Design a protein around this nucleic acid. Sequence first.
RNA 1: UCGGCGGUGGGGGAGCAUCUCCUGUAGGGGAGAUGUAACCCCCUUUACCUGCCGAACCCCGCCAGGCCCGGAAGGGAGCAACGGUAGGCAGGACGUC
Length: 87
Amino acid sequence: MIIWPSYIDKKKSRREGRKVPEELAIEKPSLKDIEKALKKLGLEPKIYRDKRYPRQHWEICGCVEVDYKGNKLQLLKEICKIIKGKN
RNA sequence: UCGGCGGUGGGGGAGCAUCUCCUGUAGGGGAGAUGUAACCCCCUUUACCUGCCGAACCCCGCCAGGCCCGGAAGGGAGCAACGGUAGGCAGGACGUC
Ligand SMILES: [Mg+2]
Ligand SMILES: [Mg+2]
């Protein structure tokens, strides 16, 4: 499964790729945070910094690949809650 | 003769904008709500047709090449060009003074 940072970017609107509602979204989210959250969830994330999201093909944002067999949107919601939840 | 003003409203269907959701282990596929002038229709019983300017900085659509995701197939955002709107100029049977 791929996770594009735009999915949870609070700066982006839905048309631009945000898949998460405003109150969970993270402003300019980091792959370092995305990866940390996924590991906390028992998964094996792998960062690819070279990749660009077609909706913003000029912006070298990278992405995270993790083998996941559950609901995608719901994992994104969980990732966000973990990130906004570091003590 | 001159001369002066004026350019309707309304319901739908798109598409788009933003938000929220469902879904697909990339790109993506869909729903709803609120907004909308741009496309289509219709509705009437007066508001039509002209060329030509016009969004230089994002007003909307659309988009060659390139760029992106992809082994490919396929998709995506999208600059130029191209089409339009708001709006200006000239005119032209039509409303009014
Ligand atoms: Mg092309
Ligand atoms: Mg390739």
